[PDB]
Design a protein around this motif. Structure first.
Motif, mmCIF file in Angstrom:
data_model
loop_
_atom_site.group_PDB
_atom_site.id
_atom_site.type_symbol
_atom_site.label_atom_id
_atom_site.label_comp_id
_atom_site.label_asym_id
_atom_site.label_seq_id
_atom_site.Cartn_x
_atom_site.Cartn_y
_atom_site.Cartn_z
ATOM 1 N N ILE A 263 1.288 5.741 4.368
ATOM 2 C CA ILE A 263 0.536 4.576 3.897
ATOM 3 C C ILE A 263 0.789 3.322 4.744
ATOM 4 C CG2 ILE A 263 2.333 4.523 2.062
ATOM 5 C CD1 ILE A 263 0.793 2.465 0.528
ATOM 6 N N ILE A 264 -0.120 2.356 4.639
ATOM 7 C CA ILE A 264 0.007 1.079 5.313
ATOM 8 C C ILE A 264 0.341 0.002 4.297
ATOM 9 C CG2 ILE A 264 -1.255 -0.718 6.558
ATOM 10 C CD1 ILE A 264 -2.869 1.493 7.876
ATOM 11 N N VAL A 265 1.382 -0.777 4.596
ATOM 12 C CA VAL A 265 1.863 -1.864 3.743
ATOM 13 C C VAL A 265 1.863 -3.141 4.552
ATOM 14 C CG1 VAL A 265 3.596 -2.361 2.025
ATOM 15 C CG2 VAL A 265 3.639 -0.165 3.180
ATOM 16 N N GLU B 99 12.252 -1.412 9.057
ATOM 17 C CA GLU B 99 11.062 -1.338 9.891
ATOM 18 C C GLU B 99 10.326 -2.666 9.937
ATOM 19 O OE1 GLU B 99 9.859 0.851 12.827
ATOM 20 O OE2 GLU B 99 11.308 1.532 11.319
ATOM 21 N N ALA B 100 10.500 -3.470 8.901
ATOM 22 C CA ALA B 100 9.901 -4.790 8.892
ATOM 23 C C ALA B 100 10.672 -5.751 9.793
ATOM 24 C CB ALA B 100 9.821 -5.325 7.477
ATOM 25 N N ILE B 101 11.995 -5.626 9.813
ATOM 26 C CA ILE B 101 12.822 -6.536 10.619
ATOM 27 C C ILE B 101 12.826 -6.131 12.101
ATOM 28 C CG2 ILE B 101 15.213 -7.302 11.068
ATOM 29 C CD1 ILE B 101 15.338 -7.396 7.824
ATOM 30 N N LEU C 260 2.937 -2.491 8.498
ATOM 31 C CA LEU C 260 3.606 -1.265 8.879
ATOM 32 C C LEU C 260 2.798 -0.107 8.341
ATOM 33 C CD1 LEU C 260 7.276 -2.121 7.752
ATOM 34 C CD2 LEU C 260 5.929 -3.335 9.460
ATOM 35 N N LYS C 261 2.778 0.983 9.092
ATOM 36 C CA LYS C 261 2.185 2.214 8.626
ATOM 37 C C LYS C 261 3.358 3.158 8.534
ATOM 38 C CE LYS C 261 -1.401 5.667 9.763
ATOM 39 N NZ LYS C 261 -2.850 5.744 10.117
ATOM 40 N N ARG D 156 -5.943 -0.270 -2.103
ATOM 41 C CA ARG D 156 -5.414 -1.565 -1.738
ATOM 42 C C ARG D 156 -4.193 -1.429 -0.855
ATOM 43 N NH1 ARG D 156 -7.660 -6.350 -4.893
ATOM 44 N NH2 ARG D 156 -9.048 -5.259 -6.385
ATOM 45 N N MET D 157 -3.995 -2.444 -0.031
ATOM 46 C CA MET D 157 -2.892 -2.471 0.899
ATOM 47 C C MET D 157 -1.795 -3.302 0.259
ATOM 48 S SD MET D 157 -3.636 -2.989 4.928
ATOM 49 C CE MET D 157 -4.048 -4.739 4.689
#
Lengths: 139, 997
Positions: free
Chosen positions: B196-198, B229-231, B215-216, B287-288
């Motif tokens: 998923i993509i967030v 993965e966000a940082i 991010l996917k 929804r994302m």
């Protein structure tokens, strides 16, 4: 129809003339109960209030007497005069209450008098059930 | 709730006694310690600090003022309309807000010098009853409960501090999660990139700025992995070697955690990302997900509290057949016509009937009623099961021709003996048919009405007996007097109200030992016991002791009225402790609360279970509080629940403060809506709204109704009132449509402006239950993979016939859709623009998805509604969203008294336009399949719904008295028949209502 005919149908709409009068007599019954308990907690409210206004005029006793301009006056004259209006307010409440009780008991009476009658006319319908199919119910 | 169940199609991957509203100016009698009453003219919205400052400004006029102390040395006290005296410490409090009765204040100095100890008895406020009406109950059970329950409170408070900051955060803000880690395969395929993509956000204010980082990632990728993965993304740079990078996405990985943007959820627990309810909803809904990196510091900063205090001979070995002396009831109501009488009917009861019960000699059908009788009931004394009850009533019928219950044993284990006075309850509403054991009526002096005086047998100091003596009923099964296929564990698979034959009871009891292998039959086995034999029962106690555990679904059946035995229930509770998870606990929290009504004693196993979770998981605390408070007006349960509430409030922590805001807010609403409903405010919308807005502008309202949390979902903060957007939804009892700015840091930003209906009129309870059952069906469905989409909007009863309903945006009744577009004399049903209405909104490849949604939801309801036999659906019950989805509102009337949702042609057309009829299209074929799978699925899980309903029998609800009301749902789901058998029955009912199979 053979024996007792469709005379068991006029017996059904009449059945509701009391089956619904039960419901309407019951809510009146249910309503009036809280009504009473409202009045009853109101009186204790009255009580402690009454209870409080004595503790005050009796504070300006040995505390005001310690002198007896002098006209530290009209206050005490009316502090009594208000107590009057409260005791008579509570008095008014009290008689309103037992009337509503006498009412409550009345509403109870007529309900514990319909119930069996309403129920005795219940199964006379249900027993004689077999007397397109289904047509008699509607109207 | 999050969005508005709105799919994005083809995103792919003020008061006084007697008076309602005190005049903007009243005269308040102030009373001083010098004896002098002054009369101050106050604005109704004034703080006590403002009235005090005045009083002491006016004091210098009034002689004996030389006796008056410093302003900041006194406190106001008065009589509140709950008939109590209250020291008004929080002098912030506004005149109109202090519940008041008579307009007077009385000065006095802070006695009890524990200011902080009496403050805390706020609580009575949250409870809706003074925490001192308890400080006065004689009944030692009560006083013991209040004392003995704080263990759990101490336990809970410990289980939160142990782990210092994180633990609390996790108490507050529990993770909101579906309880299966496995993800349905019709969801998985909306995913089918496998993942998923967030969009994870970072605020960098006072530069105000918010930065997205998309991010996917894996669907099962835990939150710690997501923060990582966000940082990585944020920190990646031409100046950082990948090695240098890796020791940053590290040396500050865990200073952060995740937060749903716009409400107050927090993923704080290693779980697959998609196991959180927010993410899974984001999927289904197209929804994302937007999440926020929050500094632990800035979370852990928000949370204060950690405050807790607490300022407070023989046996069954008897040789006589039980007798009870019936003396005299002192009051009745009627006076004779013919075949009418009065007599105290008595029974000895364990759930339902041991022993041939006894009606005592009929004497004097009116005049002051004596009986002076003794009543010999034909069972031994040692044979009495713990929890055997005296059931009695008075009512009569036609003798010739044409109420109260009592625990026979104390909470102490002591057999009840001697003098007892029993104030009786007014007979119910669909009851004379009985003697009434169902009655909460168990353990039950009332208030002043009909009163029976009693006398119990007496023989030197009596009690029950440690499981020592009990277990020692090995003696019996080591009795072998041998002077005299097993294909019957089919009847485990058999709904609880199946009613079994005495012949079968004997059988199950016979092969009793061969069920510790088939444990789910226990309920049936328990029904099989002749409960008036100390012999069978004591053996039972011992099977139960080490019986194998059971699924909470089945293990709940043992908590209804039918299983009233400390030993049975303890196992039941221990099943719930064993494996019934915080998720499924708040699904079934209503029932679990209700069941508490048949719990014989205040202190007991189930309450302690509940109280502890409620004190552990603040999401549960909230509804536990509300579900109990809701019924505080009902005097049969008040004391129990009030008492339950006090312990709870005394230990929940800072949350208490939140709940009062909630409660003050609801108090204001209930008083306002009253005015409009009553106080001859049956004027006109225009006038009313005038009033509505003037009132909400007063600073007392403004304060009460602005910084609080949604009782419907406390994650949702409610900020300032939109006000322009507030209206009397009038069109009924006057419900209020309310509108709040969502004060979230990423508020409109990323998801909402908050909306809710407050209705003061209808009994919300039934609606509440049915919405709950809809959710439950919807869950059976999604897991089984068979996707149909219900919309069980929020609905909370908050008191006697008062509540909040969730607004769902962009939705309309069919009637609305029909009026929106068309001329003519005919309706045309806008068969056009209820499909053309759907063609618009959903132009393009969107259309197909919208027709699908409709089809799903339509089928969903169609079944749910038939199964439960509800309302009877027309064009202002049935609602569609732009979105495509269909959903039912205002179910109202429950379990019927057949086929409530008849599919009009309008709905047939929507299943893509067919010419002469659409009774046979392949769109409709597809559809029928779903229903048959839906009905057959709920069929498979029937016993659950029987229970849920049954556990719900302790509640006024005129729709649910008896098990024979639950019979309807037993019929509708197929009585005895087979699956492929009942499938036919359903069709017969589809065809009979539609005129076309």
């Amino acid at each position: 129809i053979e024996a007792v005919g469709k005379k068991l149908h006029e017996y059904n709409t009449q059945f509701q003339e009391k089956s619904r009068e039960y419901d309407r007599l019951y809510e009146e019954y249910t309503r009036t109960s809280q009504e009473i308990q409202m009045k009853r907690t109101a009186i204790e409210a009255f009580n402690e209030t009454i209870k409080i206004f004595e503790e005050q005029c009796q504070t300006q006793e040995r505390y005001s007497k310690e002198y007896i301009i002098q006209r530290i006056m009209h206050n005490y004259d009316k502090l009594k005069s208000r107590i009057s209006e409260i005791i008579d307010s509570r008095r008014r409440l009290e008689e309103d209450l037992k009337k509503q009780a006498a009412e409550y008991r009345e509403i109870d009476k007529r309900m514990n008098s319909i119930k069996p009658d309403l129920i005795q006319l219940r199964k006379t319908r249900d027993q004689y059930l077999m007397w397109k199919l289904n047509e008699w119910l509607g109207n | 709730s999050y969005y508005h169940h709105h799919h994005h199609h083809d995103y792919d991957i003020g008061e006084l006694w007697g008076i309602h509203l005190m005049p903007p100016r009243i005269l308040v009698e102030c009373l001083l310690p010098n004896g002098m009453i002054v009369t101050l003219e106050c604005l109704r919205e004034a703080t006590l600090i403002t009235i005090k400052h005045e009083l002491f400004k006016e004091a210098r006029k009034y002689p004996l003022h030389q006796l008056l102390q410093d302003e900041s040395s006194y406190i106001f006290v008065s009589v509140t309309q709950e008939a109590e005296r209250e020291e008004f410490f929080d002098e912030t409090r506004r005149l109109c807000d202090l519940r008041l009765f008579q307009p007077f204040l009385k000065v006095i100095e802070p006695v009890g010098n524990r200011e902080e100890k009496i403050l805390n008895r706020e609580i009575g406020f949250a409870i809706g009853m003074p925490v001192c009406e308890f400080d006065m109950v004689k009944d030692p059970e009560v006083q013991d409960f209040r004392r003995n329950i704080l263990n759990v409170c101490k336990e809970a408070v410990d289980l939160r501090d142990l782990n210092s900051p994180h633990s609390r955060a996790m108490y507050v803000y529990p993770p909101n999660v579906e309880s299966s880690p496995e993800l349905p395969k019709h969801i998985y395929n909306k995913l089918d990139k496998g993942q998923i993509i967030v969009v994870i956000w970072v605020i960098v204010s006072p530069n105000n700025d918010k930065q997205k980082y998309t991010l996917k990632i894996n669907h099962d990728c835990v939150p710690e992995q997501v923060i990582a993965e966000a940082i990585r993304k944020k920190t990646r740079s031409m100046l950082l070697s990948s090695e240098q990078l890796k020791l940053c996405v590290l040396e500050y990985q865990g200073k952060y955690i995740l937060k749903v943007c716009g409400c107050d959820e927090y993923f704080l627990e290693k779980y697959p990302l998609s196991q959180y309810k927010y993410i899974r909803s984001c999927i289904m809904l197209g929804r994302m997900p937007n999440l926020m990196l929050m500094a632990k510091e800035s979370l852990y900063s928000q949370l204060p509290m950690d405050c807790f205090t607490m300022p407070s001979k023989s046996l069954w070995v008897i040789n006589s057949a039980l007798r009870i002396k019936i003396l005299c009831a002192t009051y009745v109501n009627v006076n004779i016509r013919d075949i009418d009488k009065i007599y105290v009917r008595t029974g000895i009861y364990h759930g339902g009937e041991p022993l041939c019960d006894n009606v005592n000699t009929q004497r004097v059908p009116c005049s002051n009623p004596r009986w002076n009788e003794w009543l010999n009931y034909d069972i031994y004394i040692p044979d009495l099961p713990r929890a055997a009850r005296l059931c009695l009533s008075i009512c009569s019928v036609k003798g010739r021709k044409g109420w109260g219950n009592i625990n026979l044993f104390d909470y102490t284990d002591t057999l009840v003996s001697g003098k007892m006075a029993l104030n009786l309850w007014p007979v119910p509403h669909g009851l004379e048919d009985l003697l009434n054991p169902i009655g909460v009526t168990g353990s039950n002096p009332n208030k002043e009405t009909p009163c029976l005086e009693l006398e119990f047998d007496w023989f030197s100091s009596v009690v029950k007996f440690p499981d020592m003596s009990v277990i020692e009923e090995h003696a019996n099964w080591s009795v072998s007097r041998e002077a005299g296929k097993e294909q019957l564990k089919a009847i485990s698979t058999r709904d609880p109200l199946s009613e079994i034959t005495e012949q079968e009871k004997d059988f199950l009891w016979s092969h009793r030992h061969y069920c510790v292998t088939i444990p789910e039959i226990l309920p049936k086995l328990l029904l099989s016991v002749k409960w008036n034999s100390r012999d069978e029962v004591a053996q039972m106690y011992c099977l139960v002791k080490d019986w194998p555990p059971i699924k909470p679904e089945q293990a709940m059946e043992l908590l209804d009225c039918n299983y009233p035995d400390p030993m049975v229930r303890g196992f039941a509770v221990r099943c719930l402790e064993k494996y019934l998870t915080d998720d499924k606990l708040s699904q079934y929290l209503i029932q679990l609360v209700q069941v508490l009504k048949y719990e014989q004693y205040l202190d007991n196993l189930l309450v302690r279970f509940l109280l502890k979770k409620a004190l552990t998981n603040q999401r549960i605390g909230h509804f536990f509080f509300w579900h109990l408070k809701s019924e505080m007006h009902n005097k049969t349960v008040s004391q129990r629940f009030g008492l339950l509430l006090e312990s709870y409030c005394r230990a929940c922590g800072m949350y208490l403060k939140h709940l009062n805001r909630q409660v003050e807010a609801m108090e204001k609403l209930i008083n306002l809506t009253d005015i409009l409903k009553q106080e001859k405010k049956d004027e006109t919308q225009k006038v009313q709204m005038k009033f509505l807005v003037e009132q909400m502008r007063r600073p007392d309202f403004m304060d009460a109704l602005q910084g609080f949390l949604s009782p419907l979902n406390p994650a949702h903060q409610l900020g300032n009132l939109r006000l322009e957007e507030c209206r009397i939804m009038s069109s009924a009892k006057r419900p209020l449509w309310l509108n709040w700015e969502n004060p979230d840091i990423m508020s409109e930003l990323l998801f909402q402006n908050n909306e809710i209906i407050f209705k003061n009129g209808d009994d919300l309870r039934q609606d509440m239950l049915t919405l709950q059952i809809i959710r439950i069906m919807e869950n059976i469905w999604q897991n089984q993979g068979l996707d149909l989409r219900m919309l069980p909007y929020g609905c909370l009863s908050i008191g006697d016939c008062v509540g909040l309903i969730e607004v769902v945006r962009n939705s309309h009744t069919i009637m609305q859709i029909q009026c929106k577009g068309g001329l003519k004399g005919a309706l045309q049903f806008n068969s056009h623009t209820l499909h053309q209405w759907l063609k618009d909104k959903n132009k393009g490849e969107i259309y197909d998805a919208a027709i699908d949604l409709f089809t799903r939801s339509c089928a969903g309801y169609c079944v749910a509604t038939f199964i439960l036999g509800i309302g009877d659906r027309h064009n202002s019950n049935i609602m569609v969203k732009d979105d495509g989805q269909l959903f039912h509102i205002d179910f109202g009337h429950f379990l019927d008294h057949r086929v409530p949702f008849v599919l009009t042609q309008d709905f047939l057309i929507v299943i893509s336009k067919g010419a002469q009829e659409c009774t046979k299209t392949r769109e409709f074929e597809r559809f029928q399949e779903m229903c048959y799978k839906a009905y057959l699925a709920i069929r498979q899980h029937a016993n659950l719904f029987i229970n849920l309903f049954s556990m719900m029998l302790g509640s006024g609800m005129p729709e649910l008295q008896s098990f024979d009301d639950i019979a309807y749902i037993r019929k509708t789901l197929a009585l005895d028949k087979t699956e492929q058998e009942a499938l036919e029955y359903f069709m017969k009912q589809m065809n009979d209502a539609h005129h076309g199979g």
